[PDB]
Symmetry: C2
Subunit: 148 residues, 2 copies
C-alpha cells in the first residue's frame, strides 16, 4: 500500500507538471493563434512548438481530428501521415485515444512510444489539449519507465 | 526538523521545475536566437517570451548586464528602465543579484516582487540564465508565500 501510494504521488505530481508544460506551449503560440487568418500562422507556430523542450524527452506533437500528424518535434517525417489506426505494443490506440482524451475526457492517456534518450519504445503518460481553430490535438508527455 | 525537511523538499522540487520552465523559454526562442543577425530577431523573441505562462504568476522577465529591463511580461512599462540599484522591501538588490546569479553563480535568488494574482509584493524564488549573444539575463520565478 505504501509503495503504491508513493507511485501515485509521483504520477499526480507529473500530471500537474504536464498541465504547466502544456500551458507554456499554448501561450507561446497565443499571439500567432489569436491573430491567425485561415491558417496563415500555423507554419510559424509549428516552428516554435517543435523547438521547445522541458528535458531531452520532453517535447510536443499534434494531430488533427482525423489522426493526421500536423507536427512532430522528434520525427518530423510523421507530418502528414494518417496515424488514426496506430496501436502501441500493448494494443493501445494511441492517436484515437489522445484525440478523445483532449475532446471528451481529461486529456491524459497511458501508452508506449519512442523515447528519445534511448531510441526505443517506453511507457509514457501523455497529456493533450484541443485547439479548435486549427483542429490541433496538441500533446506532450512524461516517460514513466523510471517509476515502472 | 521534520517541518523544516518538508519545506526543503518543496523548495528543491520547485527549483527542478524552474530549470524546466527556463528550458522551455530558451528553446522556444532558439530558432530566432540562432538565426539572429545583430539583434534583428530580438523583437520577435520578446513577443513570444512575454506571452508565455506556466501559471498566472509564472512569467518571464529579462535585464541586460547594466540592469536595464529588456522585457517584462507583467509590467512592460519597465522596459528600457535602469533597475540596477533597485532593492526589495528587505534590502535585497534584486537585479544586480539576478545578473550575478546567472553569470557567476547557480542562477537562483530569493527576493520579494509584485505577485500578479494579488497585485502586491510577495516572497519569490527567482531563476535566471544568461543569453550572451543578446546580453539578456532571462529569468522567471515561483512565489513561496504558500510555504512561508
Amino acid at each position: 500500500a505504501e509503495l503504491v501510494r508513493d507511485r501515485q504521488e509521483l504520477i499526480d505530481a507529473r500530471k500537474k507538471e504536464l498541465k504547466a508544460y502544456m500551458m507554456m506551449g499554448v501561450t507561446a503560440i497565443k499571439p500567432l493563434y489569436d491573430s491567425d487568418v485561415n491558417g496563415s500562422n500555423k507554419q510559424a507556430a509549428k516552428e516554435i512548438l517543435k523547438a521547445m523542450r522541458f528535458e531531452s524527452d520532453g517535447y510536443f506533437f499534434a494531430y488533427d481530428s482525423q489522426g493526421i500528424n500536423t507536427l512532430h518535434a522528434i520525427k518530423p517525417s510523421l507530418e502528414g501521415k494518417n496515424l488514426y489506426d496506430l496501436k502501441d505494443e500493448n494494443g493501445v490506440a494511441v492517436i484515437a485515444g489522445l484525440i478523445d482524451a483532449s475532446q471528451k475526457g481529461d486529456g491524459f492517456l497511458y501508452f508506449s512510444w519512442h523515447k528519445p534518450t534511448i531510441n526505443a519504445q517506453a511507457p509514457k503518460l501523455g497529456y493533450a489539449e484541443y485547439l479548435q481553430k486549427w483542429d490541433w490535438v496538441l500533446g506532450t508527455g512524461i516517460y514513466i519507465d523510471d517509476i515502472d
